[PDB]
């Protein structure tokens, strides 16, 4: 009974690949290659936020573009005030392996997950905890906000969840993946996200339904982390076989590779700029290649920092850079 | 006229928490992370010194994701059980040859002639891994065993102090 | 994209032989380590070989060690394993298993908790 099924299966997903070959009949290098380059990208650093004691492990900037909020390895939440250097908040946890923080959009809430497998919530109106959701069974890796009111976490059990903060419970569960799901990224619409994990899948998710719309599968190894293109068609991955891809949402495939054989050292965090033009990526031999999206080039190199970069971030008015290291430093390009 | 006020205002709301960070750098780097293998994490004290232990018994066994964000700890205790053993022989050889836990060390517990041989035969074979590759492992056996942890973790940390000289 | 096929199998006799074939598709086989891995049933995943990435470094379980032997070839794009003189009490579904990482020598795939990159299992058979 197994087998006739499985042929079934290996037929529909002969239907796939053939289909999304004939779709394509171009390349994006052929149509992108004529256009004028952007040349090469001189990024100073202009702020060194060191307030942490162990290794900053995420930052998320906020859409006031000026707060940002880091947490590392100590125990320790900081919301940095950007502009002018200063802490405006340090927040202790419970758990000091701290994998994740997030800051919402209205600016009121931030939320940290750990290896406690347990999103926190913390009110900024002394700050306290809130609401702790605690419904994974692994570990939890990326958390993000909807609005105020929902969350969305990507666990390390296989499964990402749509959390409601004033009860509790998991309104939704989304549950196609077959490896740990590292990284979610929100698009601009903020009704679908994609997740990224062990698979070497990438996986798009409708947040009302929640059915896996679309796979899309052209890695080796396992993604790190991934982040939409700002107009929401598209979205480049990270991965450990140190090429970042750009995939379409709406051509089902990958658009195109960025890699190099001098680059054996995998993507820890990518990021776009504000038009687009431009893709971040963070590597694990302590620089942070720039790439021109459109035409696979290198536009420049960020190599200011000591140690693993974790989070790399551009802000919403796409002023700054802010990439957070092993070292303990929060360093703002611009 | 009003960043003035602002200058005024951040300047003593950072100040008091710098020097928050600096009363708990101290309680910082007074604590030596553990590991355990084979959620919780429980700190104590034997000899006025912190050890904050985290067990991982609640994740999954995927572990090529969640142990890196291990490798600041000072010791990785690892506890086996008596083909339970070969699977763990490639456990230690894993996290033994891995590119971000290269600097970690790693103590054993294994939990009359015949049973001798036996605890020996184990301790020859994990002690054949070590060979193959700045970390020492650290066999021990069964029957107190929170003292071995404290004793082996001090010569961890003298051997940590000896690299920086150049010493050894 | 990561798949796995394996050919071989069967039911043998006691004693006889069996070549498991598994052939790699997806990913450039040069960079990646080779597992081959067990599950008999009954009992949970085991571990039998490896190769690294040039086709040097083979290791074993001792159960196996002297009856089986394995090799890849990067060119052909795949795996193979001899067994020797096989026992009736070795019977299990051998998967062909890849460590999840290019250019390095650490491996994590005898997991069963839904582990991505490894084959369909091959049911190796030894009657009486």
């Known amino acids: 009974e197994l087998d006739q099924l499985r042929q079934e299966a290996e037929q529909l997903k002969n239907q796939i690949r053939d289909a999304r070959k004939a779709c394509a009949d171009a390349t994006l290098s052929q149509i992108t290659n004529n256009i004028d380059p952007v040349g090469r990208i001189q990024m100073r650093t202009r702020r060194t936020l060191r307030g942490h004691l162990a290794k900053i492990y995420a930052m998320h900037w906020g859409t006031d573009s000026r707060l940002l909020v880091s947490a590392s390895q100590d125990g320790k939440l900081i919301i940095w005030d950007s502009y002018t250097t200063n802490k405006v908040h340090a927040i202790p946890l419970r758990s000091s392996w701290v994998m994740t923080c997030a800051y919402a959009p209205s600016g009121n809430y931030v939320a940290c997950g750990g290896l406690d497998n347990i999103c926190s919530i913390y009110n900024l109106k002394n700050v306290r905890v809130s609401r702790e959701l605690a419904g994974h069974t692994g570990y939890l890796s990326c958390c993000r906000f909807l609005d105020d009111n929902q969350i969305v976490t990507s666990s390390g059990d296989t499964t990402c969840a749509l959390w409601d903060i004033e009860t509790g419970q998991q309104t939704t569960t989304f549950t196609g993946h077959t490896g740990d799901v590292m990284s979610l990224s929100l698009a601009p619409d903020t009704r679908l996200f994609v997740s990224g994990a062990c698979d070497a899948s990438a996986k798009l998710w409708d947040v009302r339904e929640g059915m896996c719309r679309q796979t899309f599968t052209g890695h080796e190894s396992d993604i790190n982390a991934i982040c939409f293109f700002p107009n929401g068609n598209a979205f480049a991955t990270g991965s450990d076989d140190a090429t970042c891809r750009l995939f379409d949402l709406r051509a089902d495939q990958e658009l195109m590779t960025y890699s190099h054989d001098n680059i054996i050292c995998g993507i820890t965090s990518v990021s776009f700029s504000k038009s687009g033009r431009l893709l971040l990526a963070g590597y694990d031999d302590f620089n942070c290649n720039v790439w021109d999206a459109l035409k696979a080039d290198r536009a420049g190199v960020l190599a200011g920092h000591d140690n693993r970069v974790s989070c790399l971030g551009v802000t919403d008015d796409g002023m700054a850079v802010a990439t957070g290291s092993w070292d303990s430093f929060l360093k703002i390009w611009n | 006229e009003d960043q003035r006020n602002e200058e005024k205002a951040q300047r003593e709301a950072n100040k008091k928490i710098e020097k928050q960070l600096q009363k708990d750098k101290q309680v910082y780097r007074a604590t030596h992370r553990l590991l355990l293998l084979g959620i919780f994490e429980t700190k104590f004290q034997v000899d006025k010194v912190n050890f904050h232990m985290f067990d991982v018994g609640g994740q999954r066994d995927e572990r090529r994701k969640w142990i890196q964000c291990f490798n600041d700890v000072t010791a990785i205790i690892f506890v086996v059980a008596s083909n339970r053993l070969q699977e763990a022989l490639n456990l230690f050889k894993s996290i033994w040859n891995n590119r971000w836990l290269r600097t970690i060390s790693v103590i054993l517990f294994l939990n009359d002639p015949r049973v001798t041989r036996a605890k020996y035969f184990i301790r020859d074979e994990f002690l054949r891994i070590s060979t193959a590759s700045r970390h020492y492992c650290y066999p021990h056996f069964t029957c107190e065993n929170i003292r071995r942890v404290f004793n082996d973790c001090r010569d961890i940390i003298q051997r940590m102090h000896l690299r920086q000289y150049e010493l050894l | 994209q990561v798949q796995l096929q394996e050919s071989g199998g069967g039911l043998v006799q006691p004693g006889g032989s069996l070549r498991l074939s598994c052939a790699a598709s997806?990913?450039?086989?040069?960079?990646?380590?080779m597992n081959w891995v067990r599950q008999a049933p009954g009992k949970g995943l085991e571990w039998v070989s490896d190769?690294?990435?040039?086709?040097?470094?083979?290791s074993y379980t001792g159960s196996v060690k002297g009856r089986f032997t394995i090799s890849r070839d990067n060119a052909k794009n795949t795996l193979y394993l001899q067994m020797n003189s096989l026992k009736p009490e070795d019977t299990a579904v051998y998967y062909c298993?890849?460590?999840?990482?290019?250019?390095?020598?650490?491996?994590?795939?005898?997991?069963?908790?839904?582990?991505?990159?490894r084959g369909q299992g091959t049911q190796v058979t030894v009657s009486s």
């Open positions: 298993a890849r460590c999840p990482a290019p250019f390095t020598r650490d491996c994590f795939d005898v997991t069963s908790t839904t582990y991505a990159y």
């Open positions: 997806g990913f450039t086989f040069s960079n990646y380590k």
């Open positions: 190769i690294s990435q040039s086709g040097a470094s083979i």
